[PDB]
Amino acid sequence: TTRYLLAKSAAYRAHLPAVRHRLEPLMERGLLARCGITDLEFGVSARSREDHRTLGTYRRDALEYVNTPDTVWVRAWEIQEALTDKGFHRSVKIPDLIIAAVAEHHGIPVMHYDQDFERIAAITRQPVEWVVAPG
Amino acid sequence: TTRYLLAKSAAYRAHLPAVRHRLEPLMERGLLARCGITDLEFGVSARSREDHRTLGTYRRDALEYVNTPDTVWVRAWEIQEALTDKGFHRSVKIPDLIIAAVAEHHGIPVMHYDQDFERIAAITRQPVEWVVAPG
User: How far apart are alpha carbons A4 and A64 in whole angstroms?
Assistant: First the structure.
């Protein structure tokens, strides 16, 4: 039904059996999504220039593209402001703010393995989901 | 004449006398630029929610805005690919790729204090400048 914007923390664990068990059916159904910044974070995992090309081909084959509206910069600033008094603005990574803003714009959950997405969602009220139960 | 897109590595050193000596005249002349992502990285330095607001007001008063075109995501991916064989894709931060793409789009140098901008410029041939001589 709804797609999930897959965050690095889950993608980098796609090889673990429980995580694969969740991600493979979503992928086969076309329910995993990517955007500009999640592709960039995925590209860090390349092991050669050609492998970076292989990874790009995989991502374009396996995850549905969603656009990044130009509102993400201010939205991320708003979220960062709301995280500041608790001090989370110094630990929540800038790319994760952008990912959250993209997912919120499209009305899709972020699928992740990082409590920081729960810290963002406490502010935005947007849907987020652990790829597998954290415990 | 030309503006400079100010990167975090220089902004975070604005209090050092040599750096202030370079940045204050540029600021007074309206020659320092900001974009969505450089403002986000600056916001990490806030020391309270209200201070985050103070910092935002300062940035809007002190640095000229430039837009972030939707081409930055693919441009950053291209740069990351060209950094991959040397291994720099695993150390050059995603926000710095975006900053470089913004500056390149606008034809303005990045003003920085991080050799990673020189690694990017070796690929793109775009202008970059140390805020003060690195040595």
Answer: 9
Quoted resolution (Å):
1.3
CB contact under 8 A, A74 and B36: yes
Nearest to B80 by CA among B72, B69, B92: B92
Contact A89 B44 (CB under 8 A): yes
What domains are defined for chain B? 1-135 (3.40.50.1010)
CA dist A94 and B39 (Å) reads: 10
Tokens matching residue A103: 């997912």
Tokens of B17: 């006398």
Which residue, among B34, B73, B78, B116, would best test binding to A if mutated, counting the most A CBs under 10 Å from its CB?
B73
The CA distance from B65 to the nearest CA of chain A, in Å, is 12
User: What is the crossing angle of helices B49-62 and A72-84, to 10°?
Assistant: 140
Contact A81 B40 (CB under 8 A): no
